[PDB]
Amino acid sequence: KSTYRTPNFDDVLKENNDADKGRSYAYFMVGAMGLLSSAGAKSTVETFISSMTATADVLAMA
Amino acid sequence: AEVTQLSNGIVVATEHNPSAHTASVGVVFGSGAANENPYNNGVSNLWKNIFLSKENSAVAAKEGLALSSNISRDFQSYIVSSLPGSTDKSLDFLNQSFIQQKANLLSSSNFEATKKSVLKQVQDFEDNDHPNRVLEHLHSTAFQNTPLSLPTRGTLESLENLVVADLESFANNHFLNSNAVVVGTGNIKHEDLVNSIESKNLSLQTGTKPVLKKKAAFLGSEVRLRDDTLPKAWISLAVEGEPVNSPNYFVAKLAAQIFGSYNAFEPASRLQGIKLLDNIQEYQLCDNFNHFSLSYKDSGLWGFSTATRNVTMIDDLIHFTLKQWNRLTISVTDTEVERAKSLLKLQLGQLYESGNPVNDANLLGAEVLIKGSKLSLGEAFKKIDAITVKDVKAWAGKRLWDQDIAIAGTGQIEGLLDYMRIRSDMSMMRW
Amino acid sequence: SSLYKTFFKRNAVFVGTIFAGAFVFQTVFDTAITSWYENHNKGKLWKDVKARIAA
Numbered sequence A: 001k002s003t004y005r006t007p008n009f010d011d012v013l014k015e016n017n018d019a020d021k022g023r024s025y026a027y028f029m030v031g032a033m034g035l036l037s038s039a040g041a042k043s044t045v046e047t048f049i050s051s052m053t054a055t056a057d058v059l060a061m062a
Numbered sequence B: 001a002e003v004t005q006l007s008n009g010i011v012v013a014t015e016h017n018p019s020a021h022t023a024s025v026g027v028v029f030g031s032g033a034a035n036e037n038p039y040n041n042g043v044s045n046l047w048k049n050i051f052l053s054k055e056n057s058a059v060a061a062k063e064g065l066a067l068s069s070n071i072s073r074d075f076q077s078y079i080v081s082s083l084p085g086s087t088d089k090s091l092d093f094l095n096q097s098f099i100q101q102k103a104n105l106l107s108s109s110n111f112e113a114t115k116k117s118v119l120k121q122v123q124d125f126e127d128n129d130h131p132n133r134v135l136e137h138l139h140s141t142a143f144q145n146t147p148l149s150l151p152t153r154g155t156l157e158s159l160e161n162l163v164v165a166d167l168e169s170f171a172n173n174h175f176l177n178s179n180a181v182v183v184g185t186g187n188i189k190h191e192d193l194v195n196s197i198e199s200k201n202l203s204l205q206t207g208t209k210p211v212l213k214k215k216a217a218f219l220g221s222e223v224r225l226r227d228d229t230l231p232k233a234w235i236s237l238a239v240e241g242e243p244v245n246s247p248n249y250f251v252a253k254l255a256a257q258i259f260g261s262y263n264a265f266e267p268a269s270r271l272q273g274i275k276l277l278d279n280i281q282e283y284q285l286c287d288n289f290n291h292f293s294l295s296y297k298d299s300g301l302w303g304f305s306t307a308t309r310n311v312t313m314i315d316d317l318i319h320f321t322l323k324q325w326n327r328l329t330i331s332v333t334d335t336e337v338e339r340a341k342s343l344l345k346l347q348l349g350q351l352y353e354s355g356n357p358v359n360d361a362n363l364l365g366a367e368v369l370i371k372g373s374k375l376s377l378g379e380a381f382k383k384i385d386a387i388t389v390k391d392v393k394a395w396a397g398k399r400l401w402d403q404d405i406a407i408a409g410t411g412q413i414e415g416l417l418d419y420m421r422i423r424s425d426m427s428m429m430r431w
Numbered sequence C: 001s002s003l004y005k006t007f008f009k010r011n012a013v014f015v016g017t018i019f020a021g022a023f024v025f026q027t028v029f030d031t032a033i034t035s036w037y038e039n040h041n042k043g044k045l046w047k048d049v050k051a052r053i054a055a
């Protein structure tokens, strides 16, 4: 077979009527994953950092 | 520097130049490999070869005429060169081969001898011309299932299954009057040629128009022709470029001049004012590279091609090259642009004004077929000098920044990383 | 989706915007969850028990 005859990708290729269709979806997903991760990391860090603050039993009002 | 073009029944285009010594005459049709099908692919190249066949060529040699033909994507041309005095005898041979002998050239003994020659011709190309082979496959994948994907020389399988009838069918559908332009370059006058043409009447298939098709489109993709037996790796990479008659036609060509071409063995080449050279010369990432801005009727390709024996560092070659291209959107300098302008003029000049009329014919013909006229060399320079850093940035931010690419390569390309890795380098991280 | 191309225009969302949105999310999300949680458990909470007490 001739290498110049590219195999069929029709089943995978999107009928390009909206050029930035896959891009907008991918970037939204990537962006949302980045958002929820950053909030998660912040919460995780604060959880550990706050474990070092004065314990409930040592806040005695003399 | 005169661009004269008038229309009677046929459109005549000429560009006279006093001192020339010779004159070239020929017809250029507005159809090429981009008009063929995957199955009759190579018919145009086949036509070119019989037009230059020993028989037809000997008839012109006796008369003291030289033949030349060129098969491209958007067009096709048949040229006859002669002395300034025999400017009329070239037209006799032109008409005699496109009306009288448009049945004598297609003999069963001539066709088979020619077919056998283009087969060994196209085979030799695929077997040894790796850089052009790669560039051809680049068009193939970049424009797959679209007109620009078909290779100019045609494929071996479509060629060997081609018959005399296919030639005729193509000739009767594209070698029409409304899809043609008679070009004359050398020293002969416009009025000198148009008279000899308007002298002999006869329309021959007038009013007939060529068949239509579907618009060309760029598809980010790749074709990897790995071959570990080859001593090097040849790669070509590009983004969707600019079509001819595009506002950014020149901005694109200037952008390619910024990175230019290189040859590691030429002392002077290693000294060019190209920032990319600081990166690639340390470990000698390649033997050579060259950027280009290919333009066609419906689309184009902007990118580069390269050859290398440093098979374990191909990723650095691609990485440094793409980082430089990133600069066009964010930090290209005034002096880089200015250096490009000067060098673009020098190269554009050396092309448009060579001491060979056959090149002039192809350049003139191809232009008038698309825009109905030719932009003067002096007009180009005005457009080139008018380009600012802001223009290049706006162009790059639209054509290069975070845009799909097309890749093709052959030889020892194990080190050429996956698509996504290359594609990710079309941009940079930022706050 | 053209809704994306209005705010970010074919480009990915940048870290700064991601970080900024994260601080906003944290506050909003917490209130939304606490509200639903306390409402779902109406009657069982100490807030509710204290209302039924007077001393």
Ligand SMILES: CCCCCCCCCCCO[C@@H]1O[C@H](CO)[C@@H](O[C@H]2O[C@H](CO)[C@@H](O)[C@H](O)[C@H]2O)[C@H](O)[C@H]1O
Binding pocket: A030, A034, A037, A038, A041, B402, B424, B427, B428, B429, B430, B431, C010, C011, C012, C013, C014, C015, C016, C018
């Ligand atoms: C481990 C603790 C977790 C910390 C948080 C996780 C990391 C969040 C990273 C968030 C955003 O990081 C961001 O990524 C996008 C790509 O996705 C980058 O975008 C870059 O690549 C994209 C994609 O080719 C281009 O469109 C864009 O023009 C370019 O700038 C952006 O400049 C960077 O700022």
